[PDB]
Amino acid sequence: QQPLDCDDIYAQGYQSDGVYLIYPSGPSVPVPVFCDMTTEGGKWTVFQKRFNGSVSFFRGWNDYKLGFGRADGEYWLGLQNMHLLTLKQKYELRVDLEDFENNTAYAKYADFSISPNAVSAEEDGYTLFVAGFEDGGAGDSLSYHSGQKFSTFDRDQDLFVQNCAALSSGAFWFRSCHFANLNGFYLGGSHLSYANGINWAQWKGFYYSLKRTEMKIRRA
Amino acid sequence: QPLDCDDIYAQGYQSDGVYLIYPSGPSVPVPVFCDMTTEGGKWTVFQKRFNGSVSFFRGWNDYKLGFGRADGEYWLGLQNMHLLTLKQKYELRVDLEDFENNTAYAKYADFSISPNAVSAEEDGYTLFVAGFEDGGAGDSLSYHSGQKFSTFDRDQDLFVQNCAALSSGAFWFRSCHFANLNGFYLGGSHLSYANGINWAQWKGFYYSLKRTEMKIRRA
Amino acid sequence: LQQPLDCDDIYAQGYQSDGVYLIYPSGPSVPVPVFCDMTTEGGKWTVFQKRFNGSVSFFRGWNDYKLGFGRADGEYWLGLQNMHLLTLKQKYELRVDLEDFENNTAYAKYADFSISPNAVSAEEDGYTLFVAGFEDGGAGDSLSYHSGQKFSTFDRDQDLFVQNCAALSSGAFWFRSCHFANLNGFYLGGSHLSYANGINWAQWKGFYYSLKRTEMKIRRA
Amino acid sequence: LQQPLDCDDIYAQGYQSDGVYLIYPSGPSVPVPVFCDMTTEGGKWTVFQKRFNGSVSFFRGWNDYKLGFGRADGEYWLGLQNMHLLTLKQKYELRVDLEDFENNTAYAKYADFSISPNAVSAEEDGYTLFVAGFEDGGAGDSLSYHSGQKFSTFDRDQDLFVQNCAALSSGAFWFRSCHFANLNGFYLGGSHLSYANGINWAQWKGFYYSLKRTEMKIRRA
Amino acid sequence: DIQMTQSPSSLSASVGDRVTITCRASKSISKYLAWYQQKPGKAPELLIYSGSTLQSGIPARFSGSGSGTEFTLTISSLQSEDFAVYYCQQHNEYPFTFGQGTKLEIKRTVAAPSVFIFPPSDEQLKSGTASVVCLLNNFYPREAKVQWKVDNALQSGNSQESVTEQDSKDSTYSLSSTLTLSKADYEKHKVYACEVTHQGLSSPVTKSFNRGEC
Amino acid sequence: DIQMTQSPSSLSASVGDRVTITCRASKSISKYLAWYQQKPGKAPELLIYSGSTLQSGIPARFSGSGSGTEFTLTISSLQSEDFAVYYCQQHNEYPFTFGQGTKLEIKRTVAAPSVFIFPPSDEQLKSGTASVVCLLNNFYPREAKVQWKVDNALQSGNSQESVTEQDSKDSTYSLSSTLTLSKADYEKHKVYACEVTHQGLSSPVTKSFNRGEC
Amino acid sequence: QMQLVQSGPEVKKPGTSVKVSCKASGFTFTSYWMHWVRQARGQRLEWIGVIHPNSGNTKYNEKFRSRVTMTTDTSTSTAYMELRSLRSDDTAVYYCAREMWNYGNSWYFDVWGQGTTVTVSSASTKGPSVFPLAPSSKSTSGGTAALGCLVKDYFPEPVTVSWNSGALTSGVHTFPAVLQSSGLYSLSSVVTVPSSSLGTQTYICNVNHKPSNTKVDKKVEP
Amino acid sequence: QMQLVQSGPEVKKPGTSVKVSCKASGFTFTSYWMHWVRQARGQRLEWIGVIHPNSGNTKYNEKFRSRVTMTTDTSTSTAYMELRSLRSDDTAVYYCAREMWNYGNSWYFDVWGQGTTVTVSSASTKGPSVFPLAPSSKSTSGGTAALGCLVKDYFPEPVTVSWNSGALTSGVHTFPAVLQSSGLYSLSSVVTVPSSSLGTQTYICNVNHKPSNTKVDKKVEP
Ligand SMILES: [Ca+2]
Ligand SMILES: [Ca+2]
Ligand SMILES: [Ca+2]
Ligand SMILES: [Ca+2]
């Protein structure tokens, strides 16, 4: 029997947070992910990790579809994989953030899906959907992004005449432009340029680049 | 894994809504809406229209892989449709509604996309429908049986012109359609000829329906 | 819940009427229909090639010949990839059955038959044809000349000829300098004064005669 | 029923004669044939690399090395993608077995072996090689120098060297500044005056000696 | 919502005869209907389904037809196994209604009831209650009526009756009517009588006695 | 790590009343807390979880709220089944702490204790040990205090008491205090008395006896 | 063989809850839908609801929602149905039935249990009082007279009546019991015998009421 | 139905080990986590640890590591808990409880066993000594007097007291036993009776100590 998400791994009998194999496509091929079985009861599947700044997240539309990085350190699970999970089960979002002043923050969203109930994710541009927002330390930036297709310097889907993905040095479900750019350039602290680093607008504004970043997912 | 939605009935789910089925294989699912209510249920829907928001004047690629939202209007995709009809025998039902609060339908005993074809692409995904049981609407699809699926990208019709372009939609066109359930959502009567969502035998060529959905069930 | 991957399994399933059947060469995910000749020489024949009407054109591209094309009812070509999946997992025997426009029949059998056997990738190896010991029927031995040759089309020239023998022959085959058998040539319907471009079996009716019917059959070892 | 994805499964199926076998690393859809060494050290070895005749040229591109190339009978390379599927879902042990032209044999074992372990995509990670604890056989430890290095070809230079170490070495390998083991180098057949461009295992016969036979084997944990 | 009303409420026919039962629908129900056969003290058994299709193992003589609002179940030639209660089910929509039930009984020769009246025992009268019983033994058809008369005064609301099912050997029913009064009320009056009306009789029979006649 | 302290330690209320219990956290515990209802000599049953969500089958009158350090459990209108001990669990972190326990008892009319003193039986005194018993029968509230006096000298460390749970019929408690001394110690002194302090009394009652008085 | 084994009968007071079990054998329990139907005596069958064991999804009749709840134990292949607040009219026989599959409407029940007679009433368990129905010279029609026993005032069902410890069966007619307004049941059992045999032969009816554990033998004289 | 059947009580000497069983029925045992909790009398419940049957992974409370070890037998659907070195304060009731799954924090226990009362003490099993608590005219308040029995010095729990072979129940109050400093338990049982009925009615308390097989009947007089 195969665990397709990481809440299954909780049921399999594994509760130590680490790298694990889950089968979102099928029993043919797994894909490794890191799971945070500790935070708020555990069962978190992580589709986004950043901390060293070593891995560059200014990648193309193809890398963000298939995913890139190491499940150990910084990585991105991949938009296709994420859509496979959100397509077959209802999921909850949690993002956990940290600055360079030894402070932590987070934000939770009850519903989370990538292009939900879409017969083809490509055609729909892998839209992001987030519903009811429960506040943690940080504010609510993602509710601004709900309903927006994922954009890169390869594929501009944003509502802006310019290429907001190119101006922001990252990839996100951009609108006129982001309130959250968790794939921006790791400028490591404050920066005089506008809205191009790993920024959570509602927590540390547009001129502050976080130190650590990770976006977690759990079953409904 | 349930490859169709009649399997889902056996899985233990009977509320009509969005569901995942594995027509290709356990690797990748595709969501569909299932009508577990109509005539006992177990209907797999590969076609939905009502709001008019989603435009069905799309290309051959969108119609091969499918496009739209399983919640509202959508098209399941010709390839997926072929995987179902290839490995099981299926029954067809189409349900229609006008702007006068009237309902109609038509049933066809056998239904298949490119049956006994080694490759659906080469055959152009021919439509085959056999014995027809009459509901509210007449029989328009029997005229279309044996015709390849055509788009403004790919003209397969028997007409010198591009009947897909003239009809503002995609369908298994002949000289030209008697049913253009992917035509432009003109919402009522229209003075243009046979370019809206038209069922010729029910409301003619100058009337665009309000709702439309094509349902499929096991044998 | 048990799947027949070839048509000799269908014989074991309990079906002996020759017709259209579903077999799973890839896997239980997706089948591909074929026509089976359960009558000829004990039956259990899987047909990867049928021609008789001349309606379907076999001058197709490399992609159409890889994926397969046609109707399992009438004329068709099963597809080079499918053929490679069968011969990869089981040992198979070949029989080709031919007919001219004079109400005469002929055939030729080959003990071993495989497409790119023991090849980790068929594309890299070009789907080489291999045929071994030949048992004579009505026609002669044309295919032994072709053994070891990659499959060639006007898209992809693999032949040993400076020219594109697939282009000169108006068909697709495992060409060498050029064919002795072009069972995918143009259906010229009888005799033709042009050289070696129709459905031709050299050893039976020469290069200037185009057959009426053609089908290439396969059975387990 | 489940499909045998490696060759230790085949041992359990009931086959112990070393030869060509089909295993399904991707899934039941498509198999890939491989040669299994059911004889050496109890057997159950899956071979992803064979060389001896010198016929097959291993100076190939990144695409051929991803998908695999060659004949499971003779010399071949299984393909990095397949290799990644095996190491992704099971823990594996490495053995490389070598022979020179002086009727001498040698080998080296590595307890753990993985291609791009815990990588969400093997392509992006360049199919990094990881090998751990080394048990000494005839040859020394050359692969430990290579662990953590992406696979490099004359198509894709991933090595840490300003030059193209894959190009200078006439082969493909997980190159660093440059190899201590180039088991895909050019088959120079004995001693050679050129530097580190033949099938070379540095610690056994140095950089100026090209081995005669070579095969890299994999078995479950 | 979607009531089901069967007809006839009770039907009597002999072996070998052609019999027809009808189920009616309040609203349009489409092709889909099913029939059941319930033997006494047994679970219902399914016969026809989706209006006209019979279940495997059911004899060929069973057949169903109809569509829309009206449906019918017919049997070519009855057999001893066929006598039971038949139920009609809704089947099309999900409220799921059932039919009123149709009694299919065997038809014999008309037979009148042998009537006996039983006074209250002296043991009962000590307790403070009096029960008068009226028996109608071995009679056919089932339809019968009993009227209690005390001092030639009709009685109502104090009498209950019970009917045995059709006998196995002679196919005749039997009826028992109990008139329950108190000791004091029983002693105030003198003449007690049960008046039997039945098809095999022209005018009602009266079996009577007088209190303390012995 | 993560102590849980419940308040009040004991609460007394009647049927139909609105009752509230509070669980306190030493450190911030977040949204997650759960409550249980333990009947006497039974396994705990779970009521609320994750702070505010109730388990299936639990009556609607149970409801939970709170977040952070303070939490509350409230019942709209009590019922006879609701009287039990309630426990609050930590739930957020994995050391996993529990609440001190809150007794919810029924409130009746205040009743003073009927006091009886029982000397040691002659059988006991032969063995070499003497036990003096003081019974406080049928009294409410549960809070009561017993002080032993031998020759008008307070005693401590040699007396143990036990309290029955709340009675089912009249909802009154009962207490039994046993003063255990040796044979020799019992004979040295003369007057023995247990002094009862209770809310229903103004000053403590004293029941006493003399060795060999009766 | 394909069989459904229901729980035994239960007698409940009004307002209480009853829990009926239904165990499956002879078929994979998780594959087929399970229906619950009740048959009030001499009345129309009522469809309670549906449940699938594998998924646990339920669909109830509108009028029974909030009162009935269905569960399934997959390990024991058992289906449960529980009616929470009971009502005197709920006295009926409850069946569990399996919905076959059949490439279309389905929604018809091919395999049934065998009934769980549920009786709901505020009456308490009480034993019967047996009274003879003596024969007389006036109740003699020719050579055949009739006699019987009146089993009056007992709760709950059932009571068993036999004549001469079962030695006499020909001519016997034990009638269905009636529920009187007092909440207690009452029946009568009679038998026809030759009027000539009244003098020598002794007739005894044997009444047994297991719910209250009462065995009674009553002799009849004229 | 969903049930967890724990082991009965055990009496252990200090320093020894005890092994507690907990068998599951009504649910697939391999799917849910199993928790172990102890409830010292009138004190805070302590969570021992957790174990999953399918994987066998365990997570213990920090203070009990090295002392407690958990195992599971998958074939018999049983979960085991064993505390290696015992201590006089470990006397408590030990429960096994199932963690439901619920799409989030979970980690709350919806299904419990029914207790394994574990007693640890250096005392040896001893039978009781019953002593009468005679009524007197001085302990008489109006027309109602009290009498009782003193069940002193016995080990281990439990002892059962009944008056007149259970025929007398109204007015009885059997108090919870107390653990004396000697390591043995002691309780008392009393009953209020009319002071007038002392002359005619006889009062006998029936003490039964099954661990030592002691049945005692003691009469009380003024
Ligand atoms: Ca733009
Ligand atoms: Ca055209
Ligand atoms: Ca060429
Ligand atoms: Ca380089």
**Residue E40 and residue E44: Cα distance in Å, rounded?**
9
Coil, strand or helix: which one is E10?
Answer: strand
> Residue C124: its chain D contacts at CB < 8 A?
64, 67-70
Q: Are residues G98 and G182 in the same domain?
A: no
Distance from CA of H3 to the nearest CA of A (A): 20
A131: helix, coil or strand? coil
Residues of D in contact with A73 (CB under 8 A): none
- In terms of Cβ atoms closer than 10 Å to its own Cβ (0-12, 13-18, 19+), residue D14 is exposed
Pairing of strands H116-120, H10-12: parallel
What Å distances lie between residue B72 and B49, D97, H133, CA to CA? 7, 61, 84
Distance (Å, whole) CA B48 – CA E98: 35
Q: How many distinct structural domains can be found in chain G? A: 2
Q: Are residues G157 and G112 in the same domain?
A: no
Report DSSP state, residue H210: T
Contacts of D1 (CB under 8 A, 6+ apart): none
Instruction: Give chain E positions within 8 Å (CB) of B39.
Output: 30, 32
Domain edge (last residue) among H103, H120, H137: H120
- Rounded-to-integer distance, Cα C84 and Cα C95, Å: 17
Is residue E48 within 8 A of residue E34, CB to CB? The reply is: yes
Residues B51, B70: Cα–Cα separation, whole Å: 13
Selection from C189, C101, C98, C196 nearest residue C145 by Cα: C196
Strand, helix or coil for residue C83: helix
Phi, psi of A167 (to 5 degrees): -70, -30
Q: Which of C167, C168, C107, C118 shows the shortest CA–CA distance to C143?
A: C107
Q: Which residue has the tokens 């098209």?
A: B75
CA–CA separation, E129 and D114 (whole Å): 96
**B111 C-alpha to ligand 2 centroid (Å):** 25
DSSP output for F161-184: EEEPPPPSSS--EEEEEEEEEEHH
Residues A71/A34, Cβ–Cβ less than 8 Å: yes
Task: Tell me how far apart the alpha carbons of residues B204 and B197 are, in angstroms, rounded to a whole number.
Answer: 10
CA nearest to A36, candidates A49, A53, A24 = A49
> Whose CA is closest to G186, among G149, G135, G134?
G149
Distances (CA, A) of F37 to F41, F65, F88, F92, G15: 12, 17, 9, 20, 24
Residue ranges of A 11-40 with Cβ closer than 8 A to chain F:
38, 40
Contact D131, D110 (CB under 8 A): yes
The answer to whether residues C206 and C180 touch, using CB atoms and an 8 Å cutoff, is no
Q: Which is nearest to D138 in space by CA: D192, D96, D190?
A: D96
Q: What is the DSSP letter of H177?
A: P
Task: Answer yes or no: are the C-beta atoms of D216 and D94 closer than 8 Å.
Answer: yes
Per-residue three-class SS string for E156-190: CCCEEEEECCCCCCCCCEEEEEEEEEEHHHHHHCC
Domain boundary among G93, G120, G147: G120
* Residue F78: alpha-carbon gap to chain centroid: 20
Q: Is C10 helix (H, G, I), strand (E, B) or coil?
A: helix
Strand-pairing partners, residue A209, are A189
Task: Output the CA A148–ligand 1 centroid distance in Å.
Answer: 12
**CA separation for the pair C50, C54 (Å, rounded):** 10
In chain E, list all ranges with CATH 2.60.40.10: 4-106, 114-210
- Look up residue H155 and give its DSSP letter: B
Chain B residue nearest residue E30, CA to CA: B39
Q: How far from C13 is each of C35, F166, H36, CA to CA, in Å?
A: 16, 76, 55
Query: How far is H45 from H50, CA to CA, in rounded Å?
Result: 15
Which positions ≥6 away from B150 have C-beta within 8 Å?
A: B124, B156, B157, B162, B163, B164, B170, B171, B172, B173
Residue from E42, E54, E96, E194 whose CB has the most chain G CBs within 10 Å, to mutate: E96
Count the Cβ atoms, other than its own, within 10 Å of residue G196. Answer: 12
Same domain, H20 and H61: yes
Residue H76, classed as helix, strand or coil, is coil
Question: Which domain, by its residues, includes G173?
Answer: 129-220
DSSP output for chain B: --SSHHHHHHHT--S-SEEEE-SS-SS--EEEEEESSGGG--EEEEEEESS--S-----HHHHHH-EEBSSSSEE--HHHHHHHHHHS-EEEEEEEE-TTS-EEEEEEEEEEESTTBS-TTTTT--EEE--EEE-SS---GGGTTT---B-SSS--SSSSS-HHHHTTS-B--SSS-SB-TTSB---EE-SSSS-BS-BHHHH-TTEE-SEEEEEEEE-
In a shared domain, residues G89 and G14 = yes
The answer to whether H159 and H187 are in contact (CB under 8 A) is yes
CB atoms within 10 A of CB A61: 19
What CATH number corresponds to the domain at position H175?
A: 2.60.40.10
Give me the phi and psi of D128, to 5 degrees please: -60, 145
Query: Is G36 in the same domain as G79?
Result: yes
Same-domain check for residues G76 and G148 = no
Q: H99 and H139, same structural domain? A: no
First-to-final CA distance of chain G: 54
Q: Which amino acid is at C14?
A: G
Q: Are residues H109 and H146 in the same domain?
A: no
How long, in residues, is chain C? 221
Q: How far apart are CA D123 and CA D156, in angstroms?
A: 11
Question: Taking a C-beta distance cutoff of 8 angstroms, is the pair C27, D27 a contact?
Answer: yes
Length of chain A: 220
Of B213, B179, B168, nearest in space to B57 by CA: B168
Interface contact H26, partner G, CB < 8 A: yes
Q: Are residues G98 and G158 in the same domain?
A: no
Cα-Cα-Cα-Cα torsion F92, F95, F100, F101, nearest 10 degrees, comes to: 60
Q: Specify whether H12 is located in the same domain as H32.
A: yes
**Residue located via tokens 């129905």:** G133
CB F45 within 8 A of CB F34: no
Bridge-partner residues for A108, per DSSP? A94, A134
- Cβ neighbourhood burial of G213 (10 Å; 0-12, 13-18, 19+): exposed
Inter-chain touch A84–B28, beta carbons under 8 Å: yes
Q: What are phi and psi of C168, to 5 degrees?
A: -70, -30
DSSP secondary structure code for residue E192 in this structure: E
DSSP state, residue F120: -
Beta bridge partners of B21: B30
State the smallest CA–CA distance between residue A63 and chain D in angstroms. 8
CA atoms of D114 and D133, how far apart (whole Å): 13
Q: Which residues of A touch B70 (CB under 8 A)?
A: 117-119
DSSP state of E112: P
Beta bridge partners of C209: C191
User: Both ends of chain F: CA-CA distance in Å?
Assistant: 59
Q: Say if G114 is an interface residue toward chain E (CB within 8 Å).
A: yes
CA distance linking residue E166 with residue E176, whole number of Å: 14
Residue H197 falls in which region: left (phi positive, over 0), alpha (psi -120 to 50) or beta:
alpha
* Nearest ligand (C-alpha, residue B173): 2
Taking domain E4-106, whether its CATH number is 2.60.40.3500 is answered by: no
Question: Taking phi first (over 0 means left), then psi (-120 to 50 degrees means alpha), and beta for anything else, what does residue D82 get?
Answer: alpha
Phi first, then psi: what are they for A92, rounded to 5°?
A: -110, 145
**Contact status, residue H177 vs residue H191, Cβ threshold 8 Å:** no
CA distance D89 to A28: 10
Domain boundary residue among H56, H87, H120?
Answer: H120
Q: How far is CA E181 from CA E117, E132, E193, G134, G177, in A?
A: 16, 8, 14, 19, 18
B206 Cα–ligand 2 center, Å: 23
Shared domain check, G193 and G158: yes
CA-angle at A28, arms to A24 and A31, nearest 5°: 45
Tokens of E84: 């039971």
Structure tokens at D195: 């530097």
Which CATH topology does F114-210 take?
Immunoglobulin-like (2.60.40)
Only one residue has tokens 């008369």, namely: E149
Please indicate whether, in this complex, the C-beta atoms of E30 and B39 are within 8 angstroms of each other.
Answer: yes
Does F114 sit within 8 Å of H141, measured CB to CB? yes
CB pair distance less than 8 Å for A119 and B67: yes
H107 and H136 housed in the same domain: no
Q: How many CB atoms lie within 10 A of CB C159?
A: 24
